[PDB]
Design a protein around this ligand. Structure first.
Ligand SMILES: CC(=O)N[C@H]1[C@@H](OP(=O)(O)OP(=O)(O)OC[C@H]2O[C@@H](n3ccc(=O)[nH]c3=O)[C@H](O)[C@@H]2O)O[C@H](C(=O)O)[C@@H](O)[C@@H]1NC(C)=O
Ligand SMILES: CC(=O)N[C@H]1[C@@H](OP(=O)(O)OP(=O)(O)OC[C@H]2O[C@@H](n3ccc(=O)[nH]c3=O)[C@H](O)[C@@H]2O)O[C@H](C(=O)O)[C@@H](O)[C@@H]1NC(C)=O
Ligand SMILES: CC(=O)N[C@H]1[C@@H](OP(=O)(O)OP(=O)(O)OC[C@H]2O[C@@H](n3ccc(=O)[nH]c3=O)[C@H](O)[C@@H]2O)O[C@H](CO)[C@@H](O)[C@@H]1O
Ligand SMILES: CC(=O)N[C@H]1[C@@H](OP(=O)(O)OP(=O)(O)OC[C@H]2O[C@@H](n3ccc(=O)[nH]c3=O)[C@H](O)[C@@H]2O)O[C@H](CO)[C@@H](O)[C@@H]1O
Ligand SMILES: [Cl-]
Ligand SMILES: [Cl-]
Ligand code: NA
Lengths: 363, 359
């Protein structure tokens, strides 16, 4: 009856989409079309998520990826528009803040197709971040804004977005963690294969462009991880951009001084996060995931969007300026806990989102 | 030296860049680089402005136009990104609110090149207009905002954009009218070849998507204008978009019933605006221009971005609901006038901008 077309491109977008897609598939008023831009294309970055989270094959795969901002965004814009003219959906759902997100929103909004932004209103206040551009422009292009936190609500209101278009629904990635938890615990044997026990390692992920594209920042990080490793084993699934940059900069050797893995699937990843002594990341989603599992976290950035984690003291910023301090901060915070607090809703964000889409009516 | 790279695609943008470039051309410590996206390509929509306004040849011409929103915008984003990578400017300047404008900003922001928006903060609150989306996304992507009006300023502040990034400089298209008026006087002979008497006609332009793509709205307008023509001749430079939609909906006879022209150069157009009894338009520029020459204006839309013109009684909104209502509104308004008031500044917006960019 109502057709809702989702646009996904990259790993974190398949996980969110998994959770929301489940509710939309199950809903009777609702046919879904999934468009995968091709932004993430390696099997351990894309395929594995579709398999392990039980997502059906995309209705479209545009096969666009590996280019500049300008190539990727631009080619995505044109190709998504193509799909949209054929499919003529009632809603376009875009997720998060990848180049794929912005391309989806821009494609839709000029065709007068209502766009709903899942994970809306987050701000880094750091415009050099491409993801800051993406979420600002996406949000102002959107008709519905599904905010995960009250901070995000307040950001949107401050940018003069009407309250009637903003919905605090919490976080679908919490829905996903809750839902897929039993499957992870049953199926992952990553601890076994690595020979690791509960709380006998630190988990690390790093891929922010601002960390990977600057040789000195990256060196600071790899070196701090290696030092940390001497005291507590460090498990490092390595983003494909991070590996490419490490290699290009001649930092290959630093990956040998830790337990460096290829990108892992969600199920393995849950298990690593759950059983870590501490998570160190520059990832958006991992910051929250650490909090889900009540594991202290260190964010290797000058800022985070998820400021509630800092207030609650589950998270702590440590910009990579010298390996000495970064290593020290990590080992110190390894001993901390934040305060008890519920964030991110009740794990039924996707259900709230589905309901608001079905019941908004024609303008 | 500061490298300022201007991105322009459409007629209105050439006219603004004309005013801004003359100032930067003759400014110490500034190299100007101009990219033409190719969005307007016809000689009567593009080349004629470069020629008559003495705008230098573009350093680059990306040759993109005539496609969808998606196609135009997408190819311009990739192409403009190409040039920026080769030129590495200190600033990107974008103008107005066309698809070219958005591509330009978006290309630049992702390379961490600062973007200045010339004519920032205008709002129609008609979110469906592709120009509203364009100016909103652009304003939010820009680092400097050159607002032409106080309302444009209040619009930005309401959207959370901080005061220290907003400069009220007035309107460069005012600058342009001043500078080129004289030349329009000596070189324009359009009244001669059309055989019109000064104040012997009404001037019309229509090209908003929401008027042209909607058969019934376009019908009301060409109907209404033909009835106006029975009473006072109607002179109608027909935008190419308008011509094609009119022809598509089999409305081309209403065009022949009035004095329907291909698009004309800025010089002819200045003449026509100056010497019209009243101007009927859905253009943005042309409504300001009508006030410049104290010619009463009727704006064939449900709203305007330039609210000060309604308030000053120089302009009057007339939604295209009914051919006869629209025509009577036009015929009525032509023996009206607005109040004594100076808008859009001193004719030195271009220099105020040029100044903020070196500083
Ligand atoms: C900083 C930033 O803007 N980030 C935006 C960004 O996501 P992100 O930074 O989280 O990238 P990412 O960490 O690759 O994926 C995490 C997931 O991978 C899983 N994960 C991670 C590593 C791994 O080896 N295996 C695995 O399953 C983890 O378990 C976890 O579930 O794109 C997102 C999107 O557009 O949807 C936005 O929502 C984000 N915005 C925010 C604000 O968080
Ligand atoms: C409504 C809207 O969004 N409009 C935006 C739009 O401009 P616009 O509607 O004025 O298009 P347009 O009317 O073709 O050109 C006018 C010029 O053509 C001259 N003109 C007109 C007809 C003609 O035959 N010959 C000629 O020289 C006239 O002398 C006049 O100088 O794109 C502009 C841009 O991105 O820079 C935005 O600043 C505008 N935003 C605003 C707010 O005005
Ligand atoms: C601009 C943008 O949208 N950035 C997002 C992108 O980062 P990410 O760094 O993956 O951004 P891109 O999609 O531009 O990929 C960058 C580079 O990674 C390599 N590559 C990428 C994918 C793949 O399957 N194989 C591969 O080798 C290529 O060298 C490619 O050029 O996804 C991340 C999640 O994982 C998000 O946090 C980022 O916000
Ligand atoms: C979406 C967009 O940016 N719209 C702007 C564009 O409208 P405009 O209507 O020109 O928008 P486009 O640039 O998409 O052109 C639309 C159509 O006009 C025809 N065409 C255009 C140019 C040309 O030289 N020859 C030709 O034939 C083509 O059929 C083209 O597909 O410029 C106007 C100024 O004139 C601005 O008021 C509009 O905001
Ligand atoms: Cl990662
Ligand atoms: Cl026109
Ligand atoms: Na369904």
């Amino acid at each position: 009856w109502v057709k809702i077309l989702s646009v996904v491109g990259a790993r974190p977008q398949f996980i969110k989409a998994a959770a929301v897609s489940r509710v939309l598939r199950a809903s009777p008023g609702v046919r879904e079309v999934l468009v995968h831009t091709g932004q993430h294309y390696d099997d351990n970055m894309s395929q594995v998520f579709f398999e392990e989270l039980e997502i059906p094959d995309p209705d479209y795969h545009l096969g666009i990826g590996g280019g500049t901002h300008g190539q990727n965004t631009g080619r995505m814009l044109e190709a998504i528009e193509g799909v949209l003219l054929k499919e003529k959906p009632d809603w376009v759902l875009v997720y998060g803040n990848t180049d794929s997100t912005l391309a989806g929103a821009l494609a839709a909004v000029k065709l007068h197709i209502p766009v709903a932004h899942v994970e809306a209103g987050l701000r880094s206040f750091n415009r050099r971040m491409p993801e800051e551009i993406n979420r600002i422009l996406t949000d102002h292009a959107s008709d519905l804004l599904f905010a995960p936190t009250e901070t995000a609500v307040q950001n949107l209101l401050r940018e003069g977005i009407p309250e009637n278009r903003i919905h605090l629904v919490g976080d679908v990635m919490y829905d996903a963690a809750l839902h897929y938890g039993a499957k992870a615990e049953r199926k992952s044997r990553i601890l076994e294969r690595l020979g690791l026990q509960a709380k006998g390692y630190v988990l690390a992920t790093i891929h922010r462009a601002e960390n990977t594209d600057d040789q000195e920042r990256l060196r600071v990080i790899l070196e701090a991880l290696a030092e940390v490793h001497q005291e507590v084993p460090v498990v490092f699934p390595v983003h494909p951009r991070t590996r490419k940059r490490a290699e290009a900069f001649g930092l290959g050797s630093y990956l040998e001084k830790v337990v460096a893995l290829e990108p892992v699937g969600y199920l393995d990843m849950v298990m690593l996060e759950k059983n870590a002594r501490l998570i160190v990341t520059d990832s958006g989603g991992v910051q929250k995931e650490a909090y889900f599992y009540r594991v202290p976290c260190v964010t290797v950035r000058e800022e985070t969007e998820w400021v509630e984690l800092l207030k609650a003291e589950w998270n702590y910023l440590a910009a990579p300026q010298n390996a000495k301090d970064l290593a020290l901060t990590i080992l110190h915070r390894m001993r901390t806990k934040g305060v008890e607090i519920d964030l991110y809703g009740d794990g039924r964000a996707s259900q709230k989102i589905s309901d608001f889409l079905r019941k908004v009516g024609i303008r």
